[PDB]
Predict the structure of TRAP dicarboxylate transporter, DctP subunit.
Amino acid sequence: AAQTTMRINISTAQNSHQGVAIDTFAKEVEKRTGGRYKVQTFYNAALGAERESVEAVQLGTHELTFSSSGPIPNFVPETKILDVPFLFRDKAHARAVLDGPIGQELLTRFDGKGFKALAWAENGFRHMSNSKRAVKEPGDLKGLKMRTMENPVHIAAYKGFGIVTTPMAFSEVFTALQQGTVDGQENPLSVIISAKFDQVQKHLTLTGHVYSPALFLMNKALFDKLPAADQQAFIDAARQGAKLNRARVDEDDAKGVADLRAKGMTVIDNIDKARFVAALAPVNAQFEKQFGKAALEQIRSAQ
Ligand SMILES: O=C(O)[C@H](O)[C@H](O)CO
């Protein structure tokens, strides 16, 4: 029987929340299509880091990618609202928003930019790490040189803390931290652990300053050529991928502080979040003007 082999990649390790996502997706696609579609999985930025990969999928040089929302505004501007600091109360809030009508509407914004966005998934809440000093209050961030993703909302937000930002593809981060080009970076525990950033970062604070969604993306032309039953199979495979992805994030978050302490990191997990929110007031006010009160309240009031 005719079979098609496609490729999907991530910037992170096979042994991570995102590796679980794409391995689960590949297994489900094969099962739900009775072997007529197979998906080869690639890790650690093989086939490109996130921005390059989203571009590649748009071009069609490979078929699929799983990416955080970080580089997405370079392609689909509507997702920026999700990247606002301190927008989501907790993972349940974020997941409910993305799975429900608000997130579905955002998926439709990908169609006109040459993707099928199969499903929302999760990277996690992001936390600040660095080599220089323990961060116990927002003032401790001032002057730190921090790598960021290629995301305009994060860059503006972190400048609000007095951080000196440098956007970089994820594939360059470990080496930049090791060499001291930047003092630090920010990422969920799922990434910090799987990327072994404990080896090149002494300090971590659970600032939880933004929620980082992720997405399964497919080249639109390729998706549209799938038979209808197979389109449905790919969507359902992605949703199952998101389920196991989120479960792994939950496990990582539950055990991660003890794990990273055992590995030698000084992890500050007791901070006054209100103080960090207050520090961003000027930039918060700009985001409120940018996205509008209705859209931000629509998300904040979701339950
Ligand atoms: O820091 C980043 O670039 C991302 O969190 C990473 O590629 C996983 O999605």
Summary: The chain has one domain: 1-303. The pocket of (2R,3R)-2,3,4-trihydroxybutanoic acid is lined by residues 11-12, 50, 68, 70, 123, 149, 170, 187, 191, 212 (CB under 6 Å). Residues 138 and 276 are 5 Å apart (CA to CA).
